[PDB]
Every structure is written in C-alpha cells, then in structure tokens.
Amino acid sequence: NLDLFDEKITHLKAIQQEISRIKTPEDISWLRINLQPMKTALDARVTRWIRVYTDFLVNQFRTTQKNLLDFIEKTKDGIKKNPADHENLHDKKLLMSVMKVISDVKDVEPRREGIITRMKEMVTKLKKHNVPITEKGTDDPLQQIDNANSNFIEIYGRVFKVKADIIPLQAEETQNIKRDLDIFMKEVESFRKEFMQKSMGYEN
Known part of the structure; x- marks a missing residue:
C-alpha cells in the first residue's frame, strides 16, 4: 500500500544516516584497517536502493500526467450540436470521466502523500522547482476539467x-x-x- 511505501522510505533514510555514521574511522586491531574505499561503495548501493523508492512515481508521474493530459486534450475538442457521430465518440469520454473522477480522487490522496513523504526523508529536491510547479500545474487542469465536464454533462x-x-x-x-x-x-x-447413433463411428 501507498502508506507502507511512505513508512519504508522514512526507515530507508534513517538507514542511510545510520550507515554513514556507522562506517566509523580507521579502527586498529594489531594491523591498521581502512574502511574508506568500502564506506563509499556501501553509500553507492544505499543511494541506488533509496533512489528506486524515491523514483517509484518519478517515472509514473510523467506516465500518469501523459495519460492525464489526453483526457484534457479530449475536453479541449468540445463543440455542441452538429454531427451525431462525434457525440458517440465524445460520449464515451464522459463515461470514462465519471469512473475516473471517483476512482482518481480516491487514488489522488496517497499520490500527494507519495510526493511529501520523499521530501521529508530526501534532503535533495527532485527536478528542483519543476516538481512543486507540476503539482500546481495538475491541480489547475483537474479543476478546469471538472468545470468543462459539468458543462459537457448538461449538453450530453x-x-x-x-x-x-x-x-x-x-x-x-x-x-x-x-x-x-x-x-x-x-x-x-x-x-x-x-x-x-444407436456401432456407428466417424459420422458422429
């Protein structure tokens, strides 16, 4: 679930900070041992494991949006009256919007959490100013869709x-x-x- 992931990311980043401290200086036991070249290569493995979880929706946000944008493109077409056939195609978009509008709002909540829980346990900003702008950039269209759709439903x-x-x-x-x-x-x-048949074969 999307709350479990959140919790795992926060634990994984407590694990980073713990691992970093943990390597400790060159410890002497008759012969001198240097863990400096290893400490680095752990942090390399650690970062990659943390990255996957932090990058889990980085890819999905682009692919979701990419899918979310067409739904918008569909709306941008519009037009009232005129040919009967255009409706038949346009009508399906309403039927998909309703089921989406309900199921997406449910799935909207933990996706927002998914962004925030990284920000908490990721000191580094992902895509810099782009990620906060995209959240704002989605919210507006989402509101714009919900107005356009209610206009369409009335005409529909x-x-x-x-x-x-x-x-x-x-x-x-x-x-x-x-x-x-x-x-x-x-x-x-x-x-x-x-x-x-009844002896009789093949024909049966």
Whole structure:
C-alpha cells in the first residue's frame, strides 16, 4: 500500500544516516584497517536502493500526467450540436470521466502523500522547482476539467436523451432478432442430442 511505501522510505533514510555514521574511522586491531574505499561503495548501493523508492512515481508521474493530459486534450475538442457521430465518440469520454473522477480522487490522496513523504526523508529536491510547479500545474487542469465536464454533462444529457430514444427503438429490434436466434440455437443443440447413433463411428 501507498502508506507502507511512505513508512519504508522514512526507515530507508534513517538507514542511510545510520550507515554513514556507522562506517566509523580507521579502527586498529594489531594491523591498521581502512574502511574508506568500502564506506563509499556501501553509500553507492544505499543511494541506488533509496533512489528506486524515491523514483517509484518519478517515472509514473510523467506516465500518469501523459495519460492525464489526453483526457484534457479530449475536453479541449468540445463543440455542441452538429454531427451525431462525434457525440458517440465524445460520449464515451464522459463515461470514462465519471469512473475516473471517483476512482482518481480516491487514488489522488496517497499520490500527494507519495510526493511529501520523499521530501521529508530526501534532503535533495527532485527536478528542483519543476516538481512543486507540476503539482500546481495538475491541480489547475483537474479543476478546469471538472468545470468543462459539468458543462459537457448538461449538453450530453439533452442530446443523449434524443439518442436514449433511438437506443431502445434499435435495441427492441436487435433483442427481438437475438431472442429468435436464441431459440434457433436451442433447436439445433436439442437436434444433435435427440439424434442417437444407436456401432456407428466417424459420422458422429
């Protein structure tokens, strides 16, 4: 879970600071031992392990956003009335927005935590000023989408009500054809069961 990761990052960075102190100076035991070339190579392994966790969403933030941007691009198209076909394609974006709007808001909470918990147990800033700007840069579009979508839903409804009339009319036609096909198939499946060979081979 996304709170467990948070806790692991904070523990891993307590582990860094502990490991750094821990190497300790050149300790003498009859012969002199130098741990200076090792201490460095631990810190190298340590940083890589910490990086993965800190870089976990670094990649995903770009790929999420990249996916989040199209949803915006979809909205930027717009237009009211005009061709019926454009709606059919545009309508699906509303159906995906609703399910997203709900499930994304749930997934929005721990993603925000995911940024903050790194900042706490990462002294170094990731992408410098870019990462704080992106959070602000997402929030605005997210709000802009939620306004544009509510405008679309209102228009969507008026016309999809005209479609929801043509859907049933077409649906009744198809359902009637489907039921007829359901019956014919149940006749054909019964025919092969009724027919007993009895000796007879191959033809069965």
